[PDB]
Amino acid sequence: AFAHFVLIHTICHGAWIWHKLKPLLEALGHKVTALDLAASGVDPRQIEEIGSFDEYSEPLLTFLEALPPGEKVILVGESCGGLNIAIAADKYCEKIAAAVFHNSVLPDTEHCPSYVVDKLMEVFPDWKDTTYFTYTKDGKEITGLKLGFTLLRENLYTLCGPEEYELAKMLTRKGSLFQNILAKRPFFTKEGYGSIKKIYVWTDQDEIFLPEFQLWQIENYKPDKVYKVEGGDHKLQLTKTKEIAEILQEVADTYN
Amino acid sequence: AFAHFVLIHTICHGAWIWHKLKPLLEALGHKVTALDLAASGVDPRQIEEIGSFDEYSEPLLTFLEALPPGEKVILVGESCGGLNIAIAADKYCEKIAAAVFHNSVLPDTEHCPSYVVDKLMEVFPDWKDTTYFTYTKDGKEITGLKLGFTLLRENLYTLCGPEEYELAKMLTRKGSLFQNILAKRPFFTKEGYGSIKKIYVWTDQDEIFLPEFQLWQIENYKPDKVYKVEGGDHKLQLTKTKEIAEILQEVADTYN
Known part of the structure; x- marks a missing residue:
């Protein structure tokens, strides 16, 4: 099956990190959207204009808002992108077929939103x-x-x-x-x-x-x-692009 | 010999176009600077803030201004970058060992600055x-x-x-x-x-x-x-990176 994947980069990065994975997913027949979050990539804003992870997530929220009724997407967040996923899910859960975490933080609902970040800084x-x-x-x-x-x-x-x-x-x-x-x-x-x-x-x-x-x-x-995924590094979408695409295909065939 | 190469991207582009050539030149022992011109790449300005090719060239002029007396560089401009080279040369010719044009416009001194651009639009x-x-x-x-x-x-x-x-x-x-x-x-x-x-x-x-x-x-x-250069396309720094590096090495050994 085909799905519409929305790739979400991590802090200090931009859509460009997905430059290898995006065309590969499209070669499988999928629709792919790789966004630049606020003050990221070629977005016009500077970080000093952003006051929270929620404001930082604006492009993702705006994109989901633009999806016509009935259209669902599979979010793929890398590293700190898991936080943007959680934020987006509390506003548009009905438009999310599933969320894929890519060497990403995994927020929960029992602890404060900073919980996994505080743990990361400890490790x-x-x-x-x-x-x-x-x-x-x-x-x-x-x-x-x-x-x-x-x-x-x-x-x-x-x-x-x-x-x-x-x-x-x-x-x-x-x-x-x-x-x-x-x-x-x-x-x-x-x-x-x-x-x-x-x-x-x-x-x-x-x-x-x-x-x-x-x-x-x-x-x-x-x-x-x-x-x-065996081997590779933090940027699996660069070092194990093929493996990531194969996994995403399985997800597309599993959740809709 | 080693040289300090200053790579200059074309309009609508940024330093990123040189992402393959820069490390290759450094692997030869050269110092490489790849700039983002005004409102280009991750530069904070938007194009509407720029009123001329000279203003657009600010980062290059500012960089040359920062070079200590006696230090010379080899400018490498791609496509429309030749215009930035001409602009910079009329302010810092003494700091330029040589200018390399890479599938680039080649302004002259007998006709108006738009001469080769007008010809390009005809072709x-x-x-x-x-x-x-x-x-x-x-x-x-x-x-x-x-x-x-x-x-x-x-x-x-x-x-x-x-x-x-x-x-x-x-x-x-x-x-x-x-x-x-x-x-x-x-x-x-x-x-x-x-x-x-x-x-x-x-x-x-x-x-x-x-x-x-x-x-x-x-x-x-x-x-x-x-x-x-035989083969390749307009972006030789991507399709013939090795060949371009070899040429630049010869230039470094010829002009100082």
Whole structure:
């Protein structure tokens, strides 16, 4: 079967991270939408204009709003993208056939929205040469960050080709986890986010979202299905593009 | 020998077009700077804020200004990038060891700055699905454009892989040729732009900058050296990356 996949990049990234997977999925006959979230990729806004992970998710929410009644999509979020999925699911759960997590954070409904992010920072506290800054938006101090080139090379694009790593150095922009904002955000709901089918995809060779973290997430909030990809790195859509496409095809044939 | 190469993308593009060539040149021991011109790539400005090809060239001029006395670079401009080279050469000719034109427009000093652009539009008048718009800046009506996806696929990235073409669809932004502005701009000077060494690189398989146009340019303003790359397409830095690196190495060993 064919599905309409909506690819969601992580913070400091953009639609460009999906430049290898998008055409491959289309070669299988699928419809693919790869969005640039707020202040990401070639979006015109700067991060200082964004005050929360919800505002950051605007392009995704706006896209879902534009879907005609009856049309459902399969969301695919990488790394921090799982948070955008949860936010979108609490507004448009009826338009989501399923959500696929790609070496992604997996929010739950029993703890605060920052729960898995707080855990991530415990497991991976040293972001190496990554730099930080602060800005104020809507009366709140937000911590922004710019991914360090060494962190990118060693922990995120560990086994990616030099031409892919180059794109990361050229295109990654300043962003934010909005951690303190997430901590005070209302909990994700059981009726919305909690109701959607969730497929968790990961590799134990991820050098930032370490096994301890990902296995912890799986036990914390049981996914409907788990796929473990052998080898690769954090950016499986680059190092294991084919394997990811095969998995997404199976998801398309399973949930509609 | 090693050189410091400054790669200059064309309109509607950004530093990202050089994502394959930059690491290859560095693998040869060179220093490489790939800039995002105004309102290009991840630059924060929008095209409506830019009123001329000179303003558009700001990042390049600012970069050259930052070079300490005695430091020279080799400029490499693709497609419309030759115009940024001419503009920069009339301000910092002493900092330019040489300029390499990559399937690029080659301005001269005997005719108005729009001369080769006017000729290009004669040779290639149909930009297919490319869309146009107008905006006003500093009392002048500027014609902006957004490269059509079919034009990108068939004439610019003709033989590029699907993953490279995907990047183009995801990252190309609205831009402008500032043709009418160039037409009224003071002529490029013989003392500045005219004094620098110029190396012209091209392929007769270019599907937009057709042989008639490129051979016309070579006869109009004789380059110091001409390199003809066999095969490939308009984006030689993607389809013939290795060949381009080899040529640039020879240039580095010839001009300093």
